[PDB]
Homo-oligomer: A and B are copies of this chain.
Amino acid sequence: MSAFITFEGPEGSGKTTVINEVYHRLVKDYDVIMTREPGGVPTGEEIRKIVLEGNDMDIRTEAMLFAASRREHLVLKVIPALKEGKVVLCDRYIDSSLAYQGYARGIGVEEVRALNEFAINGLYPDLTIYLNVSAEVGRERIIKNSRDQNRLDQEDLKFHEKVIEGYQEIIHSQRFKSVNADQPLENVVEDTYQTIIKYLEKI
């Protein structure tokens, strides 16, 4: 049957790699799609461009625009797939907004949750993989992946720590499954894949 599976984690958690590798394994046996907001949905792309073009934009305005883009992605892409009985793998969803805008940026987690409950109208994921990386491991991955940087500055280090603190508060319901993302990526992929098959096959 259908399943809406989201992937969450801070920068440096291996998330992009993980979702892609898992998608490539799952597609052999499941009617699966992989997406990331706005996912090619034109209204979502237009909304997101307003944020990209913003100049010192108010963070609550940004959050509302992201929530609107989220809804467009959900109604025009995700829900149609779930109605066809597909497995939908989504790279970031409500929890990202809560950790980044709510906690790290300081709007407030409850405030951003209220906004996002309006946007999703009850459509919480069936399963959410939290790629649980420590700040230090994540930092090295971020430096490695960053084309132009060899060390992170203090502002970036602190923000990364605050995002992790936020996610830790959020994950402390049954939809969340944590995977140890401090392991080599090959193991993070394997643990994630096994977590998902157990959910899908109800074993």
Residues of A within 8 A of B (CB): 49, 52-53, 113, 124, 132, 146-149, 173, 175, 178, 180
Q: Which of B53, B132, B149 contacts A180 (CB 8 A)?
A: B53
Which B residues touch A148, using CB under 8 A? 124, 173, 175
**In the assembly, how many copies of this chain are there?**
2
Q: How far is the CA of A147 from the CA of B175 in the complex (A)?
A: 11
User: What residue in chain B is nearest A36 (Cβ atoms)?
Assistant: B172
Residue pair B180, A113 in contact (C-beta under 8 Å): no
Which B residues touch A113, using CB under 8 A? 147
Closest 7 CB pairs of A and B: A124-B148, A148-B173, A53-B180, A52-B178, A148-B175, A147-B173, A113-B147
Which B residues touch A147, using CB under 8 A? 113, 124, 173
